[PDB]
A paper describes a structure:
S. aureus bone sialoprotein-binding protein (Bbp) is an allelic variant of SdrE. The gene identified from chromosomal DNA isolated from S. aureus subsp. aureusTCH60 encodes bone sialoprotein-binding protein (Bbp) with 1149 amino acids, containing SD-repeats of 154 residues and the ligand-binding A region from 53 to 601 residues further divided into N1, N2 and N3 domains. S. aureus isolated from patients suffering from septic arthritis and osteomyelitis specifically interacts with bone sialoprotein (BSP), a noncollagenous protein of bone and dentine extracellular matrix, mediated by Bbp. As a bifunctional MSCRAMM, Bbp also recognizes the human Fg α chain and inhibits thrombin induced blood coagulation.
Based on sequence alignment of Bbp, SdrG and ClfA, we engineered a plasmid that would generate a recombinant fusion protein covering residues Asn273–Pro598 of Bbp from S. aureus, a segment containing both N2 and N3 domains, with N-terminal GST-tag for purification purposes in Escherichia coli. We obtained apo-Bbp273−598 protein and solved the structure at 2.03 Å resolution, consisting of residues Asn273–Leu584 and additional residues Gly and Ser at N-terminus, two of the remaining five amino acid residues (GPLGS) from digested GST-tag. The apo-Bbp273−598 folds into two distinct domains N2 and N3, both of which have two layers of β-sheets and are structurally similar to the Dev-IgG fold, a variant of IgG fold. The two β-sheets of the N2 domain are composed of A, B and E strands on one side and C, D, D1, F and G strands on the opposite side. In N3 domain, C′, D1′, D2′, F′ and G′ strands form one principal sheet and A′, B′, D′ and E′ strands contribute to the facing sheet. The additional D1′ and D2′ strands present the featured Dev-IgG fold. One difference occurs with regard to the D strand in N2 domain, which parallels with E strand, although exhibiting an antiparallel orientation with the corresponding strand in the description of SdrG, ClfB and ClfA. In the apo-Bbp273−598 structure, the C-terminus with poor electron density extends into the solvent region, thus leading to an open groove. Presumably, a ligand-binding site could exist in the groove.
Author numbering: 1 to 316
The structure:
Amino acid sequence: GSNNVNDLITVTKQMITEGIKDDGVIQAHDGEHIIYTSDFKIDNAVKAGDTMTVKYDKHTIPSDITDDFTPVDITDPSGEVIAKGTFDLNTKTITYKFTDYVDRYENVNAKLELNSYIDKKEVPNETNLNLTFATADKETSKNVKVEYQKPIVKDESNIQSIFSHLDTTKHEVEQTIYVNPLKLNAKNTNVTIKSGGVADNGDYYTGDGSTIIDSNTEIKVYKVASGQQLPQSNKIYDYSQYEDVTNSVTINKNYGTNMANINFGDIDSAYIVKVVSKYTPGAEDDLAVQQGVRMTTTNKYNYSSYAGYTNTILST
Ligand SMILES: [Ca+2]
Ligand SMILES: [Ca+2]
């Protein structure tokens, strides 16, 4: 009892490459793909319903922002489907189930290409990785550096953010914002969150996407203790670790049109702000989702200083 036929798969070439620039450096916050390509022969003895496995490196994941991990089919050059796959998160393994393609054709070889992202649960901070991808029996490895973003800093105003989750059925996006990650003395701290853009220097711009921010937007604020270090990945997997101070700060969800503001007053600590807001779906399946943050503080010369950040998701 075992429909697995990896023993009948002959892998003739495998490769690990990158989606943006073959750096040896993965730009995880620019959504740089880690690409696994594998060429192989399928024995004639393989039949419809047999399965083969392919293993991701544990530090990668088929999607960095949604929970849909459905793998691309294995096809021939004309797009005829050779095998359909199901992904198992815990083992980071695809099980491909062969279609009747392998009953209809013989002496078949194929290629598959898998796009993956760094798994931020497994890669909290910048680090070196020896990635290993496996089409059992065969393994291929590559050493890389994972790099994350840095905050925009203008005097005591310092801030960064990512879209950490996207739900395309509920049409909600999650923004994880690091406020004052540098743990500076930020006087009269305000953080504004708005649909569209916020330039690095704080300037608002319409931008190339939009969200809905109103009285029903969810906004949570968490204080970071001085002994705590935030993951450079900008994604938090357990918020109970942090002090919920949502009722301690002043939050105006109607600060403007699709625009909210959080008044922190004087702080000496980092904070995490997690925002869940709705977006307007695109008629086909097109996404134009964009939301920006501005941090305002009072600098030592008693003028406002501004720092800005914008996250964007665009489709096809
Ligand atoms: Ca790269
Ligand atoms: Ca066959």
